[PDB]
Every structure is written in structure tokens, then in C-alpha cells.
Design a binder for this molecule. Structure first.
Ligand SMILES: CCCCCCCCCCCCCC(=O)SCCNC(=O)CCNC(=O)[C@H](O)C(C)(C)COP(=O)(O)OP(=O)(O)OC[C@H]1O[C@@H](n2cnc3c(N)ncnc32)[C@H](O)[C@@H]1OP(=O)(O)O
Length: 411
């Protein structure tokens, strides 16, 4: 069934993954010296290219490839339009490796054909809580704890082949060359997400949406008007009313995050994430990079009363092109990022996220059912969407976990 994935170090079936009881590698140990020094071979008319994703013109070339060829729905209504500023932020965190950003171009004229990107992350990925209990019952705690230490791995994102080059087996070549470059840096696992089902996820969650501008969402056919609203004289008036929000935040002391908040925000975030089976470990530099506000890109607010930061939330912006509507160009979506609540209930924290995003001109707030996101779905009027985000590892055996045990947000 899978001419490429059957040759890779991943679990091959659901039934195999149901059988895994400890975290650890799939492949034999290898060394940097074992890995080919030269790029993987590619057709003579193509050439490998490493963009510099801090230089404006190279970022722009990658932006146009994704604008015109990245994720779109099956009805070709919406396609992601990540901004140039977003790509520089996502691709260049502290200690990033320029070599892990991999492109193919046509040699003759330099037309960009394909891309894939890796960034470093430190991830807790040892055996999950429920399987460590089973290990204790059986006298197998030592094997279950062998890989408990956080590991420096690769996160992969932005895999993209040009629409004129689809179904020619170019994606497997991109993945093999990414893998080589990563392994030449002595890193042997990766984490990735996809909306498609491949061999084999360790966790899967539904998407959720919260309408912020329901008249626009119905106009572009992102949303429809639900049937019972037809019992009203003015269905759209009642829909608007149902989703209305306050014009200003409700929590006293909410303000934008600043550099001096970095240590207190790292503390409350890490104490919270530690309770989940799979999650990141962030330094002060990575908390600054992923959470300090950047215009058009990442928005982060803290609750400070009486001089102490007790809570915070963040969201990020990804617009999508509206392909078929002749009245709107873009869908402006806000995605729930990291958060931590110590002084107020989580629903009260996240209502101010929705108030801020609406005030700033967003049309919808989206998220997946990771972290404690299920805890405010009903009260804050989110609804489940179509399909699911699946979490995968490369070269790591891992027991199936629930999405509410996943604390890693993928951009
Ligand atoms: C240690 C370091 C490890 C580093 C690497 C870790 C692994 C990283 C893995 C990547 C994680 C990326 C995370 C993200 O970015 S998910 C975002 C993916 N991008 C999009 O959906 C953008 C629009 N679509 C495209 O650009 C293409 O259709 C892509 C590029 C997706 C496939 O191009 P194309 O349609 O022209 O097909 P092909 O003939 O070249 O190749 C077909 C083979 O590709 C397999 N395929 C299809 N979709 C995906 C998918 N989303 N992940 C993994 N594999 C996928 C498929 O099962 C088949 O294999 P097999 O079934 O025959 O065996």
C-alpha cells in the first residue's frame, strides 16, 4: 500500500502501534560517519538549493511557492497564505540550522519547484504515564524509563511540491534529503503533523472553530446557517447575536507581554506543560522567540494585577486565500497557541483571547483538542470541524496516547 513509507523506520499498522509499550528508537544505532556526505541524487534538470530564510528575497521566493501550492481544501475554496514575516519567525528559532531548510529548483532557470523545512526542538517523548503504570505492575520500570530525558530532535513543516509536479515521487526525495541533513547533525528522531492518515499516528484530535465574523464566514461559505435558525424571521440577525463578544477585555490587568515577563511566563508555562505526556522544554531564548508579540504574526497577553504575572495566553495569525468569492480576498484566522492559567478559570482567560482577536479584525479562532482545549469548547461556543490533525514521530516507537496528553503546538 505504501511504496515509500513501507521502507521507513515508522510503525507500519495500527495493530502494531497498539502493541508498543515503551518509548524508544526503531532503527539500529548509526553514526554521522555512516551517513552519505553528498546530497541524495536528483534528476539532471533539477538542483538542490538552501535558501537563506533570513534574507528578504529568499523568504519571498518560498512565500510565493506556498501561496500558490500549499494546503487547500478538496473543494478548492481556501488555500493557506502564510506571510513572509510568519515564515521568518517559524523557520528561524534560537540555534536553528540553515542546512535543514531544503528546496529544489529547476537548474535551467532557477524556478522553485519544492520545499521542506526542519527546525530544532527539545521534546519530552519518554514512555507515557499509563504505560509506566503497566511497567510497574510487571517489574519493567527500568526499560520504561530508559528514554525519559528530554531529547534534541527535528520538527518538520512546510512540505510542498509545485502543482505541476504532483504524483511524480518528488516528496519522498525531499523527505530522504531532509533526513540525511538532519542525521549529518547527529539527530535521529523527528516529529510532524498532517491532516492526512499515514503510517502511523501516536495521537489524533479533531479541529475546532469559533466564529468571530459569522456574516463573512457564511458569505465565503466557510460556514453555513444551521437549520434551526430557519425558525426565526431574520436568521442572520440571530446568528450574529449568538456569536457576539464584548468590545474590550474583561480581565483586570490584561496587557501585552514584554521582555521583562519572559522568566515568569517560562515558569508558569513549563509547570503546566510538565503534566502532559508529550511536550516541549523551552529556554528563556525560546520563550522570547515563540511568545513575544510580533506584528501580523504572534499576539501574547499576560494578566498582571498588583505587579505579579499570574496567567497568559497567545494566538498566531495564518490568513488563507479565498479562491472563488468575488467579494473577499482573504480569511483572517487566529490559532490558539500556548497559555497557562493560575488565578482564574481557563474559560475566563480564553474569552479575552476571543475578545482581542475579534477586536483586531480576525474572522475565526481555530484550535485542535490538545492541551486543555476541550475544557472551554461548550461555554465559549467552539464547534468541531471536518477531519483531524494526526501526530507522528520518525524513528520512535511510541504507545497511542489521547490528544489531551499532547502539549506540542505545531505552526
Ligand atoms: C531524523 C530526521 C527525519 C526528518 C523527516 C521526518 C519525516 C517527515 C515527513 C513529512 C511531514 C510533512 C508535514 C507536513 O508538512 S503536512 C503538509 C503537507 N503539504 C501539503 O499538503 C501541501 C499541498 N500538497 C503537496 O504539496 C503534495 O501533494 C505533497 C508534497 C504533500 C505530496 O506530494 P505528491 O502529492 O506530489 O505525492 P509524491 O508522488 O511526490 O509522493 C507520494 C508519497 O508521499 C506521501 N505523502 C503524501 N502526503 C504526505 C504528507 N503530508 N506527509 C508525508 N508523506 C505524504 C504519500 O503517502 C506517498 O507515499 P507512499 O504512500 O507511496 O509510501
Amino acid at each position: 500500500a505504501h511504496a515509500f513509507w513501507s521502507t521507513q523506520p515508522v510503525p507500519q499498522t495500527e495493530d502494531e502501534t497498539e502493541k508498543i509499550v515503551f518509548a524508544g528508537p526503531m532503527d539500529e544505532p548509526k553514526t554521522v560517519a555512516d551517513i552519505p556526505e553528498e546530497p541524495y541524487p536528483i534528476a539532471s534538470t533539477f538542483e538542490w538549493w538552501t535558501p537563506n530564510m533570513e534574507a528578504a528575497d529568499d523568504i519571498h521566493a518560498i512565500y510565493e511557492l506556498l501561496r500558490d501550492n500549499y494546503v487547500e481544501d478538496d473543494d478548492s475554496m481556501f488555500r493557506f497564505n502564510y506571510s513572509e514575516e510568519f515564515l521568518q519567525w517559524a523557520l528561524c528559532p534560537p540555534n536553528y540550522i540553515p542546512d535543514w531548510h531544503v528546496a529544489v529548483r529547476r537548474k535551467a532557470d532557477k524556478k522553485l519547484l519544492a520545499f521542506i523545512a526542519g527546525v530544532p526542538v527539545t521534546l519530552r517523548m519518554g514512555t507515557p504515564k499509563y504505560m509506566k503504570v503497566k511497567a510497574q505492575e510487571k517489574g519493567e520500570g527500568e526499560e520504561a524509563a530508559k528514554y525519559d530525558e528530554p531529547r534534541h530532535i527535528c520538527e518538520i513543516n512546510f512540505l510542498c511540491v509545485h502543482k505541476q509536479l504532483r504524483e511524480k515521487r518528488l516528496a519522498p526525495i525531499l523527505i530522504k534529503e531532509a533526513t540525511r541533513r538532519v542525521n549529518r547533525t547527529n539527530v535521529w528522531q523527528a516529529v510532524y503533523t498532517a491532516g492526512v492518515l499515514l503510517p502511523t499516528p501516536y495521537a489524533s484530535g479533531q479541529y475546532f472553530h469559533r466564529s468571530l465574523n459569522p456574516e463573512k464566514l457564511v458569505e465565503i461559505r466557510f460556514s453555513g446557517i444551521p437549520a434551526q435558525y430557519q425558525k426565526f424571521q431574520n436568521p442572520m440577525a440571530m446568528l450574529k447575536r449568538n456569536y457576539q463578544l464584548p468590545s474590550a477585555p474583561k480581565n483586570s490587568g490584561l496587557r501585552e507581554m514584554k521582555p521583562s515577563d519572559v522568566p515568569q511566563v517560562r515558569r508558569i508555562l513549563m509547570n503546566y506543560l510538565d503534566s502532559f505526556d508529550v511536550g516541549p522544554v523551552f529556554s528563556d531564548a525560546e520563550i522570547s522567540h515563540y511568545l513575544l508579540p510580533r506584528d501580523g504574526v504572534v499576539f501574547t497577553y499576560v494578566v498582571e494585577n498588583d505587579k505579579k504575572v499570574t496567567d497568559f495566553f497567545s494566538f498566531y495569525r495564518i490568513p488563507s486565500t479565498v479562491i472563488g468569492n468575488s467579494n473577499y480576498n482573504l480569511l483572517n484566522a487566529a490559532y490558539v497557541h500556548y497559555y497557562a492559567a493560575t488565578s482564574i478559570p481557563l474559560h475566563q482567560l480564553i474569552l479575552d483571547l476571543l475578545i482581542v482577536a475579534h477586536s483586531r479584525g480576525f474572522d475565526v479562532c481555530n484550535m485542535v483538542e490538545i492541551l486543555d482545549n476541550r475544557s472551554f469548547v461548550e461555554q465559549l461556543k467552539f464547534g468541531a470541524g471536518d477531519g483531524h490533525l494526526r501526530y507522528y514521530f520518525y524513528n520512535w516507537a511510541y504507545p497511542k496516547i489521547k490528544p489531551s496528553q499532547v502539549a506540542l503546538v505545531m505552526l
